[PDB]
Amino acid sequence: MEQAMRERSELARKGIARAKSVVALAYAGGVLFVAENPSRSLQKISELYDRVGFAAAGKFNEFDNLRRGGIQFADTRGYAYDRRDVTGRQLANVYAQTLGTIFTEQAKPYEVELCVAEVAHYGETKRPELYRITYDGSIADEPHFVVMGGTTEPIANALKESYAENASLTDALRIAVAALRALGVASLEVAVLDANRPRRAFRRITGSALQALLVD
Amino acid sequence: MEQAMRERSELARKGIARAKSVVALAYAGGVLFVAENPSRSLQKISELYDRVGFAAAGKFNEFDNLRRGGIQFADTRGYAYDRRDVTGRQLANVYAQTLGTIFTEQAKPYEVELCVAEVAHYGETKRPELYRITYDGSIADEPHFVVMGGTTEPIANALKESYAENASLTDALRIAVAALRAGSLGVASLEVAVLDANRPRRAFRRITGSALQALLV
Amino acid sequence: MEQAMRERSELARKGIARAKSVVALAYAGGVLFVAENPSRSLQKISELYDRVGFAAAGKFNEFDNLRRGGIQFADTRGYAYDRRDVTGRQLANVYAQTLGTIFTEQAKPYEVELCVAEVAHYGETKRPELYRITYDGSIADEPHFVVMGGTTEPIANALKESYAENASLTDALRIAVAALRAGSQPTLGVASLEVAVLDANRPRRAFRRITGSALQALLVD
Amino acid sequence: MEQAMRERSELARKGIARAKSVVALAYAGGVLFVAENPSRSLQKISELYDRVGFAAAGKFNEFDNLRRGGIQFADTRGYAYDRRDVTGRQLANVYAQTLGTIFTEQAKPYEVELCVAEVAHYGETKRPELYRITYDGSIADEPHFVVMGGTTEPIANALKESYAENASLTDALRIAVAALRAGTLGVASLEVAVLDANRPRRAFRRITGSALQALLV
Amino acid sequence: TTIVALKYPGGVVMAGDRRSTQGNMISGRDVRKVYITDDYTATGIAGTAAVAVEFARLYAVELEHYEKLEGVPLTFAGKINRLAIMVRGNLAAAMQGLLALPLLAGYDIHASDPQSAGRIVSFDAAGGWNIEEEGYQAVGSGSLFAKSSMKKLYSQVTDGDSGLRVAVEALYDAADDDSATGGPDLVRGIFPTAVIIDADGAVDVPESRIAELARAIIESRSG
Amino acid sequence: TTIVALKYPGGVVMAGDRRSTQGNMISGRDVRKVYITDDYTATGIAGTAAVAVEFARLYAVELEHYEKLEGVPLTFAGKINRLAIMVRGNLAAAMQGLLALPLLAGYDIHASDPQSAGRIVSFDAAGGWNIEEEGYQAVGSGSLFAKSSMKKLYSQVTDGDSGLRVAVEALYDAADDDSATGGPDLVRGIFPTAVIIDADGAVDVPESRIAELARAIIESRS
Amino acid sequence: TTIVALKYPGGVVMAGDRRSTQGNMISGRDVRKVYITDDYTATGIAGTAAVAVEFARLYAVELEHYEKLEGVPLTFAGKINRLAIMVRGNLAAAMQGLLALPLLAGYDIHASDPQSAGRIVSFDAAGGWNIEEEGYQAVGSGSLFAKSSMKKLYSQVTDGDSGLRVAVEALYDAADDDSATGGPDLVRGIFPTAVIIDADGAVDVPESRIAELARAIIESRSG
Amino acid sequence: TTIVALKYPGGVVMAGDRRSTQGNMISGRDVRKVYITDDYTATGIAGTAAVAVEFARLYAVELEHYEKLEGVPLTFAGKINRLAIMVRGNLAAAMQGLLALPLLAGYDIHASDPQSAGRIVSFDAAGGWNIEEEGYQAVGSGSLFAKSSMKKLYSQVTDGDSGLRVAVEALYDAADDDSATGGPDLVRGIFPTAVIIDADGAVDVPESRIAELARAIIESRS
Ligand SMILES: CCN(CC)C(=O)C[C@H](NC(=O)CCc1ccccc1)C(=O)N[C@@H](COC)C(=O)NCc1cccc2ccccc12
Ligand SMILES: CCN(CC)C(=O)C[C@H](NC(=O)CCc1ccccc1)C(=O)N[C@@H](COC)C(=O)NCc1cccc2ccccc12
């Protein structure tokens, strides 16, 4: 019993430790997702619901399964009741339940680390919420930033020294890539939960726009 | 057989010992729940039914599973007969059965400890009831206070030395945070709620933020 | 599979031995159940049917599962035929079958010991019946008393030398609490006992509890 | 558990290592598939959908199972929505998911390596996409070429020095067979096919016999 | 069809005619409609032959099954409940035409008074039952006539034999007014079947006794 | 076929006739339609006998089952809800002719005022129920006559004895106007059954008492 | 049956009659048809009593169930959608005669303007719903009389008291023209039930207040 | 009910009346029958209100569901097939009377000609669909009147504004000859709702502009 759980925890931990890193930061305009991602079409950051976004680190097929399960959950709940009854705390909670079940009962535990972020609805004043869900279903309520995957200690320390609340988009982006390098456009995946969009807050920042932001 | 149950018991007990602590004690206004909890939205204290409240220590997703299952049990039984037939004894009993099954049959035993509390219905005189259910389904009927999670002996001893029946809300809160501090505490590190025997229908209310800050000074 | 059954039998036996003790004895008024129990609302003794009562030692949730199952069996049989067709022998037999299956096939055996008791129907003259069902489904028909849980030898001897088949309820209670004290030292008060009786002089439901000030009146003078 | 998984990885890796090689590379006319294959009728390269092709290395029955599953998926999706909603990224993603489940849950993992390729629809201008899916569900997006099976490093380096964006069909075929040889091949030992972006409807077509021979020369 | 059952001091008697019909056509003259289902109960059933015989057979098997499983027979109440549940089980087929109603006669060994320990239970198609306190009952297409005869003849029941003759005479009146009920056939020597039940158990009444009673009745009706 | 229940100061009484019919033919004279289902509740049922008796038996077993499983009896509200759920469950068969409606009478031990702790609950075929606040209620083919009789006679209910008298007289009016409801049979000595429930529980009223009340009513009418 | 609901500045009011019928026969005089289902919503249901009460009870359990599970109550839109789903679920039984339609009245704590936070939602047997922005709505067999009365009286609604009186008077007109809707019984002291909902929650109006308004209406119609 | 949709150079317009009925009785005056289902499509539905609103809501959720799962929206053909599959899914209930037909209007961003990228798709109760090449289409109890009006007025459509006027006027004629279709209510100020879709997406037409066009038409017919 102690052996099997030691081995599952060790396999998941080692798998996540060997993956590329991802940061999520609260800034003045909402939440910023910045991920080391060389790919052209395979995504680690995604929209879950109107004001709820998703970021993941680790084995792709696994956190993509979880990503699809989260979208299914969000759309189903919004249909069953209402779109505003869907919250980031709900999705984080279900991810905790699910990753607990996976960790204990699936053939191999998922080598993933998840972040669910929520910004305010258009025209409301609410501090963004960041949630971290680890491979065993442990869940953490974070106020400033989340770091996942790879060697997380240098990045966490870099942000601790370099994070200021309500930073501008360019500043938060630059401090984020700085923390990660502890990296151009065709090696980063960047997206934002923009609290100033009327409905769907998720929007990607790609290509020329992203480079125009990085050069400042 | 001997090996497996020894190991499961040790995994659950170690899991609970590494977790934050929770105290629930009966006071003049009902039952007081105070738990070490830094989170802003993740809850260890919950309403179960009209006069029945829930508190838990250990792994969040697991005692949250047990919490939702308890809410389903209570709501279902209250629908099947009447709201008044739902008792804290029933929820404690079904939690005992459930944790027995989980402990013996689940892939990994639950690293949780539960407390179910019941206060009297409005206007009726009945001493509060506190129930402690441990990871293997063991159930205990406790008369004054329940401590769960972390290093329980120092907190239990502190309460054993500092508890008086029928303290006011401020006195009970003080005794509680004091007992918690004797082990490894302001507003944004506590979760506080009460089963207020003086509320007409739903006795569960949370004490958060400015009000809690005023009750701590 | 020698050691699987060895370890299961030892796990259940040790589990019952670490539990508190329970006594059930026949007296002039029926059957007396006396159990060491600190709880006020968690019960080791229960009604099964009109003239059939239940007592258990060991792990609570497990013997409570068995208790609920027995109540279910009894009520279902009484509905399917008649209340008069439900007997203590029947319930003990179903408990033997059930605990046998549990012992051999469940993930962990039940750490329980059960007693099923039956008194005569109102106005009928027949001796009380006591049945002991142990963790492996073994079933025993015992004539005077049953002791379950903890260290049973001192309690059994205590009951053995001063047993009266025709003691009064108070006398049988005193003999029982004396026997329980000899197993653990000087005071077994109300706040540590659960007492109930199968009262053969009740018209229909024989099971009644003896609680609080009444039970105190039965413990002092 | 942790031993079982690395043992599975070792069985799959060894199986793929002992298998014949396959290359897929983007050229001016679309995508070119070239595979070591002595068989007359057992195929390692296949059409998946209108503009999507499939190539595999390793144990035949296993990657043929995966091939049939991919066809089932693509056809079902095109019927459920539209043919143009089927993309190579979708097939690569479902293959990653599937090989993950197989790797962790089947009695023996699949000793296979997969490539999903997509060319533009007729009359559109979009650079081809190549996807590599390995036995454990790992998925990789490749811009110029994919090599699978056997000892790959010589093939990858040979293609690296001899690959030009927008080569003709003859040049790409030459450089490809040169690279595989670097890992004497001819018509009765090769299986060749292309995703030809100039076909209006179905882009997959095979190059066999006298035609292939002309190209080889 | 007519089945009669009546209580006498110390026991119960049940008797039934022997005629089987399909519409107006007689398809049987010797059929048996009253069955001893256990040492202390007899069952007579009216209606569809297939359903009636299966009722009797399955019921006897059920009672003896419980007795062998639990070492003790069912209480009489339990026997009643089992028969009722069986009937209700057949309710749907009865609605489709496979209707059979039973009449139960028993001796309750657990009854307080051994002289009134006889029991007569009637059933309806839904399994509803009534224990007949007024001492007699009938079932079948001639049950009205037999019941009205027993209403007048019951005061003459003082022992088992007088009760037996009253039963046979009630069956006689039933056959007299109902063509589906067979009377005594003196040419073929076929007479109603009867079962008597007292503390010593349930025994078949010998045919010679019933034939003597029948001939006495016929002579009494001729002059 | 006619069941009456009325509240009196400190308790409730329920009485029912003894007649069983198949169409116009009388198939029973001694039938029992009122059953003590719990120490503090009685149930009287009208309709198909099989369904009615099964209702009473299954209901009593259900109440005591809950009581033995949980160590405490159901609240009166829970008892109401369970009887209603049982009726609703039978709705489909009732639409096919196996119809039975219950009338519930109880004494709520948890009521604040013990003098008005009596409860009378009526039901329809869909399980809809109403707690009767006007003190009396009836069910069955003669229930309209019994209800109107109690409407005129209810002012005379001051204790258990007067309430029992009014109950028996209401059953008398029911049998007077409804051929399916049986009146007092003085030749056979068969009278309605009655249950009385107060703080001491539910007890069967002895037949002799109902009989004397019956004779009082009869010569009161001559 | 008639249930009325109307918006007033800062809240909503709902009232329902007390009559229960079976055909022409009056089977209930004190019946309750308006239930507080939420801290901020009341539901009144018309139709088959069993189905109506089951709707209200099950609905309240559902709302509080979500609230305890997720720590926050449903948005008012979510409440609407769940009630609609419940009705559509009952559609088949409604075709079989177990028909019940609800009327929903609530106070949206999340609304922008706290004075127009009142909400009135009507439903059909298929679960289709409409949020009424004309201030009032009714359901039941007298609903059209009540609605047409409120059409003329709604201009007098400026607070909780005026809206409550208009509601009770609309119920009065309904009972005046519809025999299935019960009017004020001054002999028994039975009056319509009413719930008022504002920012401080949903409260039951004491019956004596409804009585006072009823007598005001009556004398207003006499002289 | 009447929903109209017409193509104009560079986009499409869809408008619908506001009337809800139960038989002859008016049960709604402000209802919305045209819904923006995604950045480039609007759906207007006629028939049973519950089924129509369920169609629109479920449909929008389905499109966005695919878009978030796969990172790219459905092709317009796929959107058509999904809506059709939904209607055919409701066919059984439609036979029982819960019938609702949608009319789809969209702007295909993947279309070759950005001026002819407008799309109007009509559906029947079996899910069969037709892409309308003659530029306009209507659905509902007044759709024949609206279509025949647009047949005469379509030559006036040269931009978004003229197309919006032709839409509002067709709804006016529909309401003129079909009592189930609501016309402009000048007393209450309730007017048809309209959505316009061009290369920049689908936007709700402000109520003021529709009110002005309605008043112009009314003043022209007086
Ligand atoms: C082939 C010889 N035979 C079988 C013994 C018969 O002719 C019996 C006859 N079948 C039928 O009438 C068949 C009915 C039927 C028609 C269509 C589909 C299915 C069933 C019968 O039951 N007749 C009834 C008339 O109903 C009132 C009857 O006589 N019933 C009397 C009766 C009662 C108890 C036990 C019995 C055992 C044997 C024979 C009769 C018995
Ligand atoms: C054979 C002896 N017996 C059973 C006791 C009867 O004759 C009763 C009679 N059966 C029937 O009428 C048969 C119903 C039926 C018909 C066709 C297919 C399936 C079922 C009855 O229920 N009559 C009804 C008339 O309905 C209004 C009745 O009297 N009901 C009153 C009643 C109420 C509560 C408990 C009762 C217990 C025994 C008898 C009657 C009881």
Ligand SMILES: CCN(CC)C(=O)C[C@H](NC(=O)CCc1ccccc1)C(=O)N[C@@H](COC)C(=O)NCc1cccc2ccccc12
């Ligand atoms: C025994 C006392 N009782 C139960 C409470 C009744 O008499 C109610 C009455 N049953 C019936 O009419 C029986 C319906 C039915 C028919 C056939 C098979 C199964 C069922 C009713 O609902 N009547 C309807 C008439 O239709 C509209 C009614 O009054 N409806 C009004 C109403 C609305 C909300 C809550 C209510 C609660 C209690 C009573 C009425 C209520």
Ligand SMILES: CCN(CC)C(=O)C[C@H](NC(=O)CCc1ccccc1)C(=O)N[C@@H](COC)C(=O)NCc1cccc2ccccc12
């Ligand atoms: C509670 C108020 N309300 C719901 C809003 C209604 O009265 C609507 C009305 N229900 C009904 O007519 C009930 C139909 C029914 C029949 C049998 C069993 C169960 C149900 C309706 O749909 N009428 C149709 C008649 O079509 C000729 C209609 O007006 N349809 C127009 C319409 C189209 C798109 C979206 C809509 C949204 C809301 C309202 C109407 C809408």
